[PDB]
PDB file of C-alpha atoms and ligand atoms in Angstrom:
ATOM      1  CA  UNK A   3      89.181  76.716  95.722  1.00  0.00           C
ATOM      2  CA  UNK A   4      88.038  79.197  98.320  1.00  0.00           C
ATOM      3  CA  UNK A   5      90.173  80.747 101.083  1.00  0.00           C
ATOM      4  CA  UNK A   6      89.158  79.833 104.608  1.00  0.00           C
ATOM      5  CA  UNK A   7      87.410  82.604 106.592  1.00  0.00           C
ATOM      6  CA  UNK A   8      87.456  80.935 109.989  1.00  0.00           C
ATOM      7  CA  UNK A   9      88.416  83.244 112.778  1.00  0.00           C
ATOM      8  CA  UNK A  10      91.650  82.019 114.423  1.00  0.00           C
ATOM      9  CA  UNK A  11      93.516  83.933 117.160  1.00  0.00           C
ATOM     10  CA  UNK A  12      96.400  81.377 117.119  1.00  0.00           C
ATOM     11  CA  UNK A  13      99.518  81.347 119.314  1.00  0.00           C
ATOM     12  CA  UNK A  14      99.889  85.098 119.363  1.00  0.00           C
ATOM     13  CA  UNK A  15      96.277  86.024 120.194  1.00  0.00           C
ATOM     14  CA  UNK A  16      95.779  87.820 116.895  1.00  0.00           C
ATOM     15  CA  UNK A  17      92.665  89.810 116.197  1.00  0.00           C
ATOM     16  CA  UNK A  18      91.531  93.009 114.400  1.00  0.00           C
ATOM     17  CA  UNK A  19      90.329  96.296 115.816  1.00  0.00           C
ATOM     18  CA  UNK A  20      88.463  99.240 114.334  1.00  0.00           C
ATOM     19  CA  UNK A  21      88.099 102.894 115.212  1.00  0.00           C
ATOM     20  CA  UNK A  22      84.846 104.308 116.462  1.00  0.00           C
ATOM     21  CA  UNK A  23      84.063 106.730 113.704  1.00  0.00           C
ATOM     22  CA  UNK A  24      80.366 107.146 114.190  1.00  0.00           C
ATOM     23  CA  UNK A  25      77.629 107.418 111.528  1.00  0.00           C
ATOM     24  CA  UNK A  26      77.422 111.136 110.647  1.00  0.00           C
ATOM     25  CA  UNK A  27      76.471 111.604 106.991  1.00  0.00           C
ATOM     26  CA  UNK A  28      79.997 112.922 106.158  1.00  0.00           C
ATOM     27  CA  UNK A  29      81.953 109.956 107.666  1.00  0.00           C
ATOM     28  CA  UNK A  30      84.255 108.304 105.058  1.00  0.00           C
ATOM     29  CA  UNK A  31      84.868 105.017 106.786  1.00  0.00           C
ATOM     30  CA  UNK A  32      82.881 103.451 109.729  1.00  0.00           C
ATOM     31  CA  UNK A  33      82.701  99.985 111.255  1.00  0.00           C
ATOM     32  CA  UNK A  34      79.587  98.246 112.544  1.00  0.00           C
ATOM     33  CA  UNK A  35      80.452  95.764 115.396  1.00  0.00           C
ATOM     34  CA  UNK A  36      76.850  94.376 115.241  1.00  0.00           C
ATOM     35  CA  UNK A  37      77.144  93.510 111.519  1.00  0.00           C
ATOM     36  CA  UNK A  38      80.923  92.797 111.524  1.00  0.00           C
ATOM     37  CA  UNK A  39      80.889  95.187 108.542  1.00  0.00           C
ATOM     38  CA  UNK A  40      83.020  98.052 107.360  1.00  0.00           C
ATOM     39  CA  UNK A  41      81.307 100.809 105.326  1.00  0.00           C
ATOM     40  CA  UNK A  42      83.605 103.055 103.403  1.00  0.00           C
ATOM     41  CA  UNK A  43      83.860 105.396 100.432  1.00  0.00           C
ATOM     42  CA  UNK A  44      85.809 104.653  97.285  1.00  0.00           C
ATOM     43  CA  UNK A  45      89.517 104.836  97.686  1.00  0.00           C
ATOM     44  CA  UNK A  46      89.329 106.420 101.142  1.00  0.00           C
ATOM     45  CA  UNK A  47      91.614 105.425 104.089  1.00  0.00           C
ATOM     46  CA  UNK A  48      90.374 102.489 106.099  1.00  0.00           C
ATOM     47  CA  UNK A  49      92.394 102.184 109.405  1.00  0.00           C
ATOM     48  CA  UNK A  50      92.525  98.594 110.499  1.00  0.00           C
ATOM     49  CA  UNK A  51      94.171  97.748 113.813  1.00  0.00           C
ATOM     50  CA  UNK A  52      96.167  94.533 114.494  1.00  0.00           C
ATOM     51  CA  UNK A  53      96.097  93.339 118.111  1.00  0.00           C
ATOM     52  CA  UNK A  54      98.140  90.478 119.528  1.00  0.00           C
ATOM     53  CA  UNK A  55      98.765  89.207 123.033  1.00  0.00           C
ATOM     54  CA  UNK A  56     102.453  88.528 122.323  1.00  0.00           C
ATOM     55  CA  UNK A  57     104.842  89.735 119.517  1.00  0.00           C
ATOM     56  CA  UNK A  58     105.190  87.240 116.656  1.00  0.00           C
ATOM     57  CA  UNK A  59     108.583  86.419 115.127  1.00  0.00           C
ATOM     58  CA  UNK A  60     110.607  88.790 112.815  1.00  0.00           C
ATOM     59  CA  UNK A  61     109.522  88.031 109.251  1.00  0.00           C
ATOM     60  CA  UNK A  62     105.849  87.659 110.276  1.00  0.00           C
ATOM     61  CA  UNK A  63     103.533  89.197 107.664  1.00  0.00           C
ATOM     62  CA  UNK A  64      99.905  90.440 107.294  1.00  0.00           C
ATOM     63  CA  UNK A  65      97.879  89.694 104.230  1.00  0.00           C
ATOM     64  CA  UNK A  66      94.599  91.132 103.084  1.00  0.00           C
ATOM     65  CA  UNK A  67      92.341  89.366 100.475  1.00  0.00           C
ATOM     66  CA  UNK A  68      88.782  89.918  99.418  1.00  0.00           C
ATOM     67  CA  UNK A  69      86.407  87.083  98.562  1.00  0.00           C
ATOM     68  CA  UNK A  70      82.666  87.190  97.618  1.00  0.00           C
ATOM     69  CA  UNK A  71      80.512  86.604 100.729  1.00  0.00           C
ATOM     70  CA  UNK A  72      77.825  84.547  98.937  1.00  0.00           C
ATOM     71  CA  UNK A  73      78.664  80.863  98.468  1.00  0.00           C
ATOM     72  CA  UNK A  74      77.334  80.994  94.875  1.00  0.00           C
ATOM     73  CA  UNK A  75      80.030  83.558  94.039  1.00  0.00           C
ATOM     74  CA  UNK A  76      82.864  82.447  96.315  1.00  0.00           C
ATOM     75  CA  UNK A  77      84.929  80.862  93.540  1.00  0.00           C
ATOM     76  CA  UNK A  78      85.001  84.087  91.482  1.00  0.00           C
ATOM     77  CA  UNK A  79      88.122  86.172  91.907  1.00  0.00           C
ATOM     78  CA  UNK A  80      87.224  89.575  93.461  1.00  0.00           C
ATOM     79  CA  UNK A  81      88.708  92.230  91.149  1.00  0.00           C
ATOM     80  CA  UNK A  82      88.280  95.819  90.084  1.00  0.00           C
ATOM     81  CA  UNK A  83      85.662  96.456  87.339  1.00  0.00           C
ATOM     82  CA  UNK A  84      86.411  97.091  83.634  1.00  0.00           C
ATOM     83  CA  UNK A  85      86.344 100.776  84.227  1.00  0.00           C
ATOM     84  CA  UNK A  86      88.432 101.198  87.297  1.00  0.00           C
ATOM     85  CA  UNK A  87      91.149  98.735  86.298  1.00  0.00           C
ATOM     86  CA  UNK A  88      91.724 101.040  83.305  1.00  0.00           C
ATOM     87  CA  UNK A  89      91.376 104.494  84.989  1.00  0.00           C
ATOM     88  CA  UNK A  90      95.163 104.788  85.473  1.00  0.00           C
ATOM     89  CA  UNK A  91      95.051 105.581  89.194  1.00  0.00           C
ATOM     90  CA  UNK A  92      97.816 103.197  90.318  1.00  0.00           C
ATOM     91  CA  UNK A  93     100.139 104.462  92.903  1.00  0.00           C
ATOM     92  CA  UNK A  94     103.165 102.970  91.245  1.00  0.00           C
ATOM     93  CA  UNK A  95     103.011  99.727  93.260  1.00  0.00           C
ATOM     94  CA  UNK A  96      99.441  98.336  93.274  1.00  0.00           C
ATOM     95  CA  UNK A  97      98.619  96.569  90.045  1.00  0.00           C
ATOM     96  CA  UNK A  98      95.479  98.412  88.625  1.00  0.00           C
ATOM     97  CA  UNK A  99      93.427  95.235  88.768  1.00  0.00           C
ATOM     98  CA  UNK A 100      93.630  94.948  92.622  1.00  0.00           C
ATOM     99  CA  UNK A 101      90.674  96.047  94.754  1.00  0.00           C
ATOM    100  CA  UNK A 102      92.656  96.311  97.992  1.00  0.00           C
ATOM    101  CA  UNK A 103      95.645  98.534  98.389  1.00  0.00           C
ATOM    102  CA  UNK A 104      97.784  99.390 101.393  1.00  0.00           C
ATOM    103  CA  UNK A 105      98.625 103.145 101.793  1.00  0.00           C
ATOM    104  CA  UNK A 106     102.006 104.556 102.782  1.00  0.00           C
ATOM    105  CA  UNK A 107     104.044 101.325 102.965  1.00  0.00           C
ATOM    106  CA  UNK A 108     106.852 100.900 100.505  1.00  0.00           C
ATOM    107  CA  UNK A 109     107.241  97.325 101.737  1.00  0.00           C
ATOM    108  CA  UNK A 110     103.758  96.330 100.608  1.00  0.00           C
ATOM    109  CA  UNK A 111     103.795  93.461  98.220  1.00  0.00           C
ATOM    110  CA  UNK A 112     100.942  92.712  95.731  1.00  0.00           C
ATOM    111  CA  UNK A 113     100.443  89.106  94.844  1.00  0.00           C
ATOM    112  CA  UNK A 114      98.581  87.401  92.000  1.00  0.00           C
ATOM    113  CA  UNK A 115      98.375  83.762  93.051  1.00  0.00           C
ATOM    114  CA  UNK A 116      99.715  81.772  90.034  1.00  0.00           C
ATOM    115  CA  UNK A 117      97.376  79.002  91.144  1.00  0.00           C
ATOM    116  CA  UNK A 118      94.069  80.512  92.254  1.00  0.00           C
ATOM    117  CA  UNK A 119      94.536  83.784  90.329  1.00  0.00           C
ATOM    118  CA  UNK A 120      93.288  85.582  93.481  1.00  0.00           C
ATOM    119  CA  UNK A 121      94.741  88.987  94.418  1.00  0.00           C
ATOM    120  CA  UNK A 122      96.162  90.007  97.866  1.00  0.00           C
ATOM    121  CA  UNK A 123      98.395  92.657  99.343  1.00  0.00           C
ATOM    122  CA  UNK A 124     100.853  91.746 102.126  1.00  0.00           C
ATOM    123  CA  UNK A 125     103.078  93.837 104.417  1.00  0.00           C
ATOM    124  CA  UNK A 126     105.632  92.992 107.081  1.00  0.00           C
ATOM    125  CA  UNK A 127     104.066  92.879 110.506  1.00  0.00           C
ATOM    126  CA  UNK A 128     105.480  95.731 112.619  1.00  0.00           C
ATOM    127  CA  UNK A 129     105.175  95.647 116.425  1.00  0.00           C
ATOM    128  CA  UNK A 130     103.427  98.617 117.982  1.00  0.00           C
ATOM    129  CA  UNK A 131     105.619 101.663 118.543  1.00  0.00           C
ATOM    130  CA  UNK A 132     106.257 103.465 121.813  1.00  0.00           C
ATOM    131  CA  UNK A 133     102.984 104.692 123.282  1.00  0.00           C
ATOM    132  CA  UNK A 134     100.771 102.419 121.193  1.00  0.00           C
ATOM    133  CA  UNK A 135      99.241  99.097 122.085  1.00  0.00           C
ATOM    134  CA  UNK A 136      98.446  98.085 118.512  1.00  0.00           C
ATOM    135  CA  UNK A 137      99.553  98.363 114.880  1.00  0.00           C
ATOM    136  CA  UNK A 138      97.451  99.959 112.265  1.00  0.00           C
ATOM    137  CA  UNK A 139      97.390  99.323 108.590  1.00  0.00           C
ATOM    138  CA  UNK A 140      95.610 101.761 106.228  1.00  0.00           C
ATOM    139  CA  UNK A 141      93.700 100.087 103.426  1.00  0.00           C
ATOM    140  CA  UNK A 142      91.878 101.494 100.426  1.00  0.00           C
ATOM    141  CA  UNK A 143      89.075  99.808  98.404  1.00  0.00           C
ATOM    142  CA  UNK A 144      89.308 100.755  94.805  1.00  0.00           C
ATOM    143  CA  UNK A 145      85.814 100.033  93.489  1.00  0.00           C
ATOM    144  CA  UNK A 146      82.303 100.541  94.735  1.00  0.00           C
ATOM    145  CA  UNK A 147      80.316  97.438  95.693  1.00  0.00           C
ATOM    146  CA  UNK A 148      77.940  98.526  92.941  1.00  0.00           C
ATOM    147  CA  UNK A 149      80.551  98.661  90.086  1.00  0.00           C
ATOM    148  CA  UNK A 150      79.172  96.925  86.973  1.00  0.00           C
ATOM    149  CA  UNK A 151      81.373  94.198  85.582  1.00  0.00           C
ATOM    150  CA  UNK A 152      83.124  94.059  89.020  1.00  0.00           C
ATOM    151  CA  UNK A 153      81.581  93.411  92.395  1.00  0.00           C
ATOM    152  CA  UNK A 154      78.214  94.184  90.768  1.00  0.00           C
ATOM    153  CA  UNK A 155      76.428  94.717  94.083  1.00  0.00           C
ATOM    154  CA  UNK A 156      77.656  91.439  95.560  1.00  0.00           C
ATOM    155  CA  UNK A 157      78.879  91.727  99.139  1.00  0.00           C
ATOM    156  CA  UNK A 158      82.501  90.891  99.862  1.00  0.00           C
ATOM    157  CA  UNK A 159      84.524  89.839 102.855  1.00  0.00           C
ATOM    158  CA  UNK A 160      88.086  90.932 103.480  1.00  0.00           C
ATOM    159  CA  UNK A 161      90.207  88.253 105.136  1.00  0.00           C
ATOM    160  CA  UNK A 162      93.164  89.339 107.101  1.00  0.00           C
ATOM    161  CA  UNK A 163      95.712  86.690 107.834  1.00  0.00           C
ATOM    162  CA  UNK A 164      98.866  86.734 110.076  1.00  0.00           C
ATOM    163  CA  UNK A 165     101.445  84.576 108.271  1.00  0.00           C
ATOM    164  CA  UNK A 166     104.954  83.346 109.043  1.00  0.00           C
ATOM    165  CA  UNK A 167     107.741  83.946 106.584  1.00  0.00           C
ATOM    166  CA  UNK A 168     106.767  80.948 104.392  1.00  0.00           C
ATOM    167  CA  UNK A 169     103.194  82.046 104.182  1.00  0.00           C
ATOM    168  CA  UNK A 170     101.954  79.535 106.712  1.00  0.00           C
ATOM    169  CA  UNK A 171      98.906  80.516 108.870  1.00  0.00           C
ATOM    170  CA  UNK A 172      99.504  82.075 112.345  1.00  0.00           C
ATOM    171  CA  UNK A 173      96.170  83.797 112.756  1.00  0.00           C
ATOM    172  CA  UNK A 174      93.072  84.951 110.773  1.00  0.00           C
ATOM    173  CA  UNK A 175      90.149  87.386 111.190  1.00  0.00           C
ATOM    174  CA  UNK A 176      87.766  88.848 108.698  1.00  0.00           C
ATOM    175  CA  UNK A 177      84.957  91.457 108.112  1.00  0.00           C
ATOM    176  CA  UNK A 178      82.367  92.237 105.471  1.00  0.00           C
ATOM    177  CA  UNK A 179      82.861  95.408 103.449  1.00  0.00           C
ATOM    178  CA  UNK A 180      80.483  97.679 101.603  1.00  0.00           C
ATOM    179  CA  UNK A 181      82.067 100.415  99.474  1.00  0.00           C
ATOM    180  CA  UNK A 182      79.475 103.194  99.021  1.00  0.00           C
ATOM    181  CA  UNK A 183      78.810 106.912  98.607  1.00  0.00           C
ATOM    182  CA  UNK A 184      77.491 107.404 102.149  1.00  0.00           C
ATOM    183  CA  UNK A 185      78.858 104.953 104.774  1.00  0.00           C
ATOM    184  CA  UNK A 186      77.325 106.833 107.729  1.00  0.00           C
ATOM    185  CA  UNK A 187      73.788 106.497 106.361  1.00  0.00           C
ATOM    186  CA  UNK A 188      74.192 103.037 105.074  1.00  0.00           C
ATOM    187  CA  UNK A 189      75.475 101.756 108.442  1.00  0.00           C
ATOM    188  CA  UNK A 190      72.570 103.484 110.280  1.00  0.00           C
ATOM    189  CA  UNK A 191      70.080 101.981 107.853  1.00  0.00           C
ATOM    190  CA  UNK A 192      71.499  98.379 108.102  1.00  0.00           C
ATOM    191  CA  UNK A 193      71.749  98.469 111.825  1.00  0.00           C
ATOM    192  CA  UNK A 194      68.151  99.694 112.041  1.00  0.00           C
ATOM    193  CA  UNK A 195      67.076  96.921 109.724  1.00  0.00           C
ATOM    194  CA  UNK A 196      68.930  94.500 112.105  1.00  0.00           C
ATOM    195  CA  UNK A 197      67.056  95.921 115.084  1.00  0.00           C
TER     196      UNK A 197
HETATM  197 ZN1   ZN B 201      84.856  99.939  89.829  1.00  0.00          ZN
END
């Protein structure tokens, strides 16, 4: 099967948000609204905001999962390449095979679907704290889009789902990701190409 990627705000008005990091050559993570695409460096922090119109129930969770963007690759589980899954860079919680990790959250759970074999990382949804209007999760992508034996230059999508305590769907959003050496340059190049 293939996880759905349909945008769904649901009852709580759930949707993602991204910082405005610009496209300077040195930027490590930058988001393109025009392409709905995040460009980032290997294993660098990717701040992703969670916005809702109303606070969901206690026990609500947020899951991140990568899938190949191209239909001809959709059924293939997105995983780290043969090199990176063996480079011993685990943080003591993320299995080394997982492409997406969550930083600084001891309650992060890493799932290997016994049915689909797909990987995902889920954390408890936390309401925004005093002074903030949104909640931010910091993700890391652990392979380059170009890694041989892994993504092998195939574009991927990250699907973020708001789930209830049983894993049922409350909301969904998604964005394309390109893990590269120079996000700033790549984003400028791709948006130019789009122009
Ligand atoms: Zn890799």
